Amino acid sequence: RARFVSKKGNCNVAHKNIREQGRFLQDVFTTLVDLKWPHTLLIFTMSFLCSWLLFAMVWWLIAFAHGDLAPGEGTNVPCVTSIHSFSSAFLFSIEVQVTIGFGGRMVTEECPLAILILIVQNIVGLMINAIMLGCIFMKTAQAHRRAETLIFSKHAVITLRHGRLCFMLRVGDLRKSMIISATIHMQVVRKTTSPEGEVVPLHQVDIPMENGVGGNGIFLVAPLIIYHVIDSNSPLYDLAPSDLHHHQDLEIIVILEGVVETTGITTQARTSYLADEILWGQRFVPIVAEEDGRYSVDYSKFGNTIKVPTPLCTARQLDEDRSLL
Amino acid sequence: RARFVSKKGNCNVAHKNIREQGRFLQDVFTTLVDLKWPHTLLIFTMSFLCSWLLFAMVWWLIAFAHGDLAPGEGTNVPCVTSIHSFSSAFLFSIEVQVTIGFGGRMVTEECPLAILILIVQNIVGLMINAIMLGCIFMKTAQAHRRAETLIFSKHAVITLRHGRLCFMLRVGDLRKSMIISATIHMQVVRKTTSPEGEVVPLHQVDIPMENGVGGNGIFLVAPLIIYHVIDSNSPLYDLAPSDLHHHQDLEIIVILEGVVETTGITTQARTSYLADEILWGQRFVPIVAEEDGRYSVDYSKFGNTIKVPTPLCTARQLDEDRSLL
Amino acid sequence: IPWRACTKYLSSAGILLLSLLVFSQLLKHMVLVAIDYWLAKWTDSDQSVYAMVFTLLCSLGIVLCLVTSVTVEWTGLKVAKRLHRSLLNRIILAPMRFFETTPLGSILNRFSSDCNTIDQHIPSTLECLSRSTLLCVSALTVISYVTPVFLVALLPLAVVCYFIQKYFRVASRDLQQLDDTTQLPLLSHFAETVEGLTTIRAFRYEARFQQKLLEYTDSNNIASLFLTAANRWLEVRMEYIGACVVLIAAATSISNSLHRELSAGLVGLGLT
Amino acid sequence: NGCFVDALNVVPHVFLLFITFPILFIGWGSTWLHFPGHNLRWILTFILLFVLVCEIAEGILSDHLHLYMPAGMAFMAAITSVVYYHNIETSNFPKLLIALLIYWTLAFITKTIKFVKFYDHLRFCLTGLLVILYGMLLLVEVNVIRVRRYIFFKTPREVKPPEDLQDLGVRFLQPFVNLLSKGTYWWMNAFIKTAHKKPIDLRAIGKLPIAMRALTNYQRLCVAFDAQARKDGARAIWRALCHAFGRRLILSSTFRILADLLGFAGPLCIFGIVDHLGKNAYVLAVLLFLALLLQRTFLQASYYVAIETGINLRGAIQTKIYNKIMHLSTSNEMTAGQICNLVAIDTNQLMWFFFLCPNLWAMPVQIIVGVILLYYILGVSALIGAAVIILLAPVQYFVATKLSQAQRSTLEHSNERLKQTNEMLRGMKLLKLYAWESIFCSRVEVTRRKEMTSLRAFAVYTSISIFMNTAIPIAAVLITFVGHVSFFLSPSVAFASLSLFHILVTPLFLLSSVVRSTVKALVSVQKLSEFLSS
Numbered sequence A, B: 001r002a003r004f005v006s007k008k009g010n011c012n013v014a015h016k017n018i019r020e021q022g023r024f025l026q027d028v029f030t031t032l033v034d035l036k037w038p039h040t041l042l043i044f045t046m047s048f049l050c051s052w053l054l055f056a057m058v059w060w061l062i063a064f065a066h067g068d069l070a071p072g073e074g075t076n077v078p079c080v081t082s083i084h085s086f087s088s089a090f091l092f093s094i095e096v097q098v099t100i101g102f103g104g105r106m107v108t109e110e111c112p113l114a115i116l117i118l119i120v121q122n123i124v125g126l127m128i129n130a131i132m133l134g135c136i137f138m139k140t141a142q143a144h145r146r147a148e149t150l151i152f153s154k155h156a157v158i159t160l161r162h163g164r165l166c167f168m169l170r171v172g173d174l175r176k177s178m179i180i181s182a183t184i185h186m187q188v189v190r191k192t193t194s195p196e197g198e199v200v201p202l203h204q205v206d207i208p209m210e211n212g213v214g215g216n217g218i219f220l221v222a223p224l225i226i227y228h229v230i231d232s233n234s235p236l237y238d239l240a241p242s243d244l245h246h247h248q249d250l251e252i253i254v255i256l257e258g259v260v261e262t263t264g265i266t267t268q269a270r271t272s273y274l275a276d277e278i279l280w281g282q283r284f285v286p287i288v289a290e291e292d293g294r295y296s297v298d299y300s301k302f303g304n305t306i307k308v309p310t311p312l313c314t315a316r317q318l319d320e321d322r323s324l325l
Numbered sequence C: 001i002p003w004r005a006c007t008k009y010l011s012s013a014g015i016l017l018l019s020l021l022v023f024s025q026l027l028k029h030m031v032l033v034a035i036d037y038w039l040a041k042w043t044d045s046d047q048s049v050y051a052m053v054f055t056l057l058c059s060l061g062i063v064l065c066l067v068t069s070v071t072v073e074w075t076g077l078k079v080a081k082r083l084h085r086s087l088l089n090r091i092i093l094a095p096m097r098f099f100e101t102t103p104l105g106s107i108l109n110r111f112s113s114d115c116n117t118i119d120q121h122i123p124s125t126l127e128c129l130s131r132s133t134l135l136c137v138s139a140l141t142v143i144s145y146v147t148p149v150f151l152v153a154l155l156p157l158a159v160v161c162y163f164i165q166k167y168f169r170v171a172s173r174d175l176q177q178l179d180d181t182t183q184l185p186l187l188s189h190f191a192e193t194v195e196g197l198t199t200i201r202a203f204r205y206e207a208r209f210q211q212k213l214l215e216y217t218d219s220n221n222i223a224s225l226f227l228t229a230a231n232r233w234l235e236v237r238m239e240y241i242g243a244c245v246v247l248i249a250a251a252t253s254i255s256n257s258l259h260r261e262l263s264a265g266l267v268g269l270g271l272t
Numbered sequence D: 001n002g003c004f005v006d007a008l009n010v011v012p013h014v015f016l017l018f019i020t021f022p023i024l025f026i027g028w029g030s031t032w033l034h035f036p037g038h039n040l041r042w043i044l045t046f047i048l049l050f051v052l053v054c055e056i057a058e059g060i061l062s063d064h065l066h067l068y069m070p071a072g073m074a075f076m077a078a079i080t081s082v083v084y085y086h087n088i089e090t091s092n093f094p095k096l097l098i099a100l101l102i103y104w105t106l107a108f109i110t111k112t113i114k115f116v117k118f119y120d121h122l123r124f125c126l127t128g129l130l131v132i133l134y135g136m137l138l139l140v141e142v143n144v145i146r147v148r149r150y151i152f153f154k155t156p157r158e159v160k161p162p163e164d165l166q167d168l169g170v171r172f173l174q175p176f177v178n179l180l181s182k183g184t185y186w187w188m189n190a191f192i193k194t195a196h197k198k199p200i201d202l203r204a205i206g207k208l209p210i211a212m213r214a215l216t217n218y219q220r221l222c223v224a225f226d227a228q229a230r231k232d233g234a235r236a237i238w239r240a241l242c243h244a245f246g247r248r249l250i251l252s253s254t255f256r257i258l259a260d261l262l263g264f265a266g267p268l269c270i271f272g273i274v275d276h277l278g279k280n281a282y283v284l285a286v287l288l289f290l291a292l293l294l295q296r297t298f299l300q301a302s303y304y305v306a307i308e309t310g311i312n313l314r315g316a317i318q319t320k321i322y323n324k325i326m327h328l329s330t331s332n333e334m335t336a337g338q339i340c341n342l343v344a345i346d347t348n349q350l351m352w353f354f355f356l357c358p359n360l361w362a363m364p365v366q367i368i369v370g371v372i373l374l375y376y377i378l379g380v381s382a383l384i385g386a387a388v389i390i391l392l393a394p395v396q397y398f399v400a401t402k403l404s405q406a407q408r409s410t411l412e413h414s415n416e417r418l419k420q421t422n423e424m425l426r427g428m429k430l431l432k433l434y435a436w437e438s439i440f441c442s443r444v445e446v447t448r449r450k451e452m453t454s455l456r457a458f459a460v461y462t463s464i465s466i467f468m469n470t471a472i473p474i475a476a477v478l479i480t481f482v483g484h485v486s487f488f489l490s491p492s493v494a495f496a497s498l499s500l501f502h503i504l505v506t507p508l509f510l511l512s513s514v515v516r517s518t519v520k521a522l523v524s525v526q527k528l529s530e531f532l533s534s
């Protein structure tokens, strides 16, 4: 069946019938700073070559028009000394534009028109250099790759903790670098029909993450199983344990947000768990172990799971049995 | 015994068995912007020298191949005027690459192949210059050093405030520059066994910071003792005052987050207090004092402590005695 | 183990045979190097007188070797005799409470093995150690004399070996004892299965016991495997250095002893 | 345009050495993934190292910097290719591999141009060998992209790094390291350094890989025994072990014979050097260095592979005879002692014989090459010398046998002594209550003298062994040199003969122990078959 957002964190829902009013290009550089590296490098070299060829053509033409291009000895001084053909003119254009300044061909004080073309060439060169540096730097603050290094366990299990049904999922870090003030927004989607006859195709509802006195966020050093307790007030509380594996369509997504240390940008990661991915009545294997003088974490058992003799029943019926026991 | 996160704020837990899928290098520049200064300077000079030597070799070869390298008078004009040996060729490479443009050796309009090598040399030079500036700037927003200037008192004491047991810890600032919207996430870890027979090697739980009507964050001007009150609902409420000093293994960590003013990045600081570090029944000495026309803060008494005649008993037993008194 | 145990072991032999052994070994190794030293001058070309001197050296070598071997034999036997007699006499005059305090295994075990072990292996191993160390010192002196400069290049590398020594022993001993331990409960386990075989086949406990024996044989193999891995490590690294030294020796000999030295009889001894 | 083609060759090495440095410096500033052709890649890289040494030799002979620079650049290029492949084995990528493939293609192109321009007109053979090696490495890279994901369709279907040797705490990782360290045991540096500080124990030690357990070796051995018994004994169990342990043993044996060949080769290049200077020698010196290191490395790898096969065999037959201990009948004291000797001495004999198995195949070729080589250096006289040394090998065996006999006798006496001690160290209070202790000590000393008497003959035989050990090397040179010149000599001849004499004396001693071990192992396997089939 159709998934809401894919495991890799990319969004699945394909958009249709966007009334484009042009804002897609109106974000001129915040559009292309999104692109890949080959496309952005291609369009940067094309910017540079475009400008260089434009001014090389205009210079070729101005040297042709002054008549300094006509090879002649005396009665003149070329506006640009030692210019012969188009090739040397393009060499002059790249010599003055990108500010190498070879000086074999000298622009002279006889023609003020060449002064004007230089005084606009250089400023446009400097402006396009300034933007083509700022945008590549604004790019190198792409830290979604740091959204790649995070990992979640492939499937999530539920258990019985403290006499109440609980669901456990793992997270973890993959580098030394921490993520500041990460917060968890844990959401459930379902095609819902209201008592008013209103049917929604998809209905996001927050399920709380259960920490100390409150709080939406967590602290990530070692793999920490996130711990929620479904109660009669919770939206997930009504389902049955035998109807989840095959038929029902329930996506439980988690969105972890946080700002990486060194860049300072705020990244996040998104993952979905389907009704066929989740399973019932198990327990993860303890990862952390007291090694020689530290805590060793073994990621081989990250996705490992052991059987646990826990009663199998619906959370509504389990709450009724708790009322009975 | 083993500590969770070290006093300096660095993380202790050593990771084992990381299924490297290559994302460690896939973060190409967000990897090296983490590095120290000597390594980053080394790899930048190696980038620059690598590119320069590459193009110096190709230019040496092209001047050799055209035959302009063969010293001869007449019947030719070198593609690059006045080129003799490899040394002068490398001088030409560094002359055109890093955009000094000496112009003693002139590239000429006779050979379009030299035009091509120049028109790729310069663009690659400009791109690698752009990245090697953006990443060093993205580095100089390392404000972890500002995470260094914060300080916490070496050990934390508990007291009796308002008829209820309380724990007091100090913090403080070390510069004029403020930290915007700092928030406190105060966590306790312990090897825990659930009533379901589940044993966890380490169990982070939030203990609230007790401010006005609510709120997770604080305001740092002068050293402010953070004030929590452990109650029967709190997770720390069950321990005994004689069993903490030696045997039990309880790390209480605090994570203070906040964004520094001038850079705008969000930094944090992390510290641990062990069961052997914390002590019982004391009071800090008042730091702030009304001086001549201001408030003087003396950091000599920062870690100083005075004895206080307070009853010594367990928080559970103290709550039972409060029920009795 | 300190030099005191060996000091007492050799002082039980007496001053009569200690020097008779040591100086004879030194002289045998000196003859074994001098024969090749004279062969070096033999090479370039009084060939008959040369060959006669070679024959004289060859005879001296074998006579001295026989003398040294007989010395080691006689000394080892005398030491074993005196040590056993002294041990018996000192155990005889002990108080009764001492005999009651110490278990019988330790008192009996020393005589059972220590004596046997020493008689079987101490003389041969001591002879081999002495021959090896003196041959090594002689070879170093040869490659030093052959090349005046090669000497100054070989003292660095040898110091390297010092660092390779420590790190080896402090592990090679350790692993060794571990092997012994994993050999002891294994065999014993076997015996326990043989006697109470009917009880074990009756309880149907064969599976758990087979599991235990797989565990024990794995614990034995891991030890006997790490030991051979460590021996291979030390072997390969010492050999790499032993090849570095011959490389440097030949590289110095080809130039120094031919270009300027103009001596060919040198490079032969050094390379060999 | 020779210099032009030399420069054209220098270029691609430079390209690769320049792209390697950023990545190498990021990587320099625990799952091992292996790719097909890894071992082939490292073998070919060592062959490249060798051919590059030869090219440097050619460049020395010719000299003109630009004419021998290509070798010095390909040297660093191949070392950096090794560094790249280490960086890829440690963390997998699809891009670094393409980064290698580009360089391989360009180097192949340059070498082809060199070959053509040479054909139109020593260099020829070296250039051809380099061409073949680069082509084979190219094919390896093409295989690697064909396997998983160079560009191929979407998802690699990548392996999922092997959990056998990389999952949950294991310390002895022999099968899961770089084929260079599989030879030089570099992975032991960490273990031995940690061992220096903290005392080793079973908690500090690893656990055996799935490649070598009781279950694995037992499974292979029982499969072979099943396939042999379904076609129906001593010969049967023998052939079963043979077919079960298969490729590893012959691999060790061929490592061993190649090492023996190179060891016989060393002294000849010594001889060549000695000849050249008395009348092309630096090349021989560096070749001697290379041949020494390679020969000894192959020898050591051979030893280790044989030892590991033997340990496998011991574990296998031990758990097998324990499996047999479950089904035996009660009618079959003496059998218990025979069983526990069948595990304490018979199994150790079997395993040590399996240690020495490849030596039994490699000894004859060693002595044959030795005798034929010394004959062509010293002529007919050599033959005479070649007899004397060989004559020490049977004599040694005889000596050994005498030792054994003596040992037996001595052991008997020793045992009796222990009995006469066990009483005294138990009736301690009884003994000292009337001071009859000296009376028993006299008897104990009486036994000791008999024990001492046996030990004299044993040590006499030990002395004869040690004496022959260093006497035959002297006697060979004596009766050879005196019997060559003054009966029937450049320094090279004499010193090569000396070297070969030592290189032949070292293996000769081992043949005697090998023969004894082999006959004892044959008897022990007959015993194991008689037991295992009751």
Ligand SMILES: Nc1ncnc2c1ncn2[C@@H]1O[C@H](COP(=O)(O)OP(=O)(O)OP(O)(O)=S)[C@@H](O)[C@H]1O
Pocket (backbone or CB within 6 Å): A017, A018, A019, A020
């Ligand atoms: N199909 C579309 N795709 C993207 N944007 C849209 C689309 N339709 C409308 N919008 C914009 O988003 C807002 C949605 O309001 P509408 O659904 O269009 O109601 P509206 O009264 O018809 O407004 P209009 O279409 O501009 S006259 C509008 O203000 C549009 O500017």
Ligand SMILES: Nc1ncnc2c1ncn2[C@@H]1O[C@H](COP(=O)(O)OP(=O)(O)OP(O)(O)=S)[C@@H](O)[C@H]1O
Pocket (backbone or CB within 6 Å): A151, A152, A153, A154, A155, A299, A300, A302, A303, A304, B017, B018, B019, B020
């Ligand atoms: N040891 C490890 N170290 C780092 N990352 C891992 C490790 N194991 C798995 N991952 C990644 O993090 C997720 C954890 O899921 P797993 O425990 O691997 O379950 P899984 O079903 O076996 O998924 P796989 O291994 O990709 S088929 C996976 O999607 C992996 O991409």
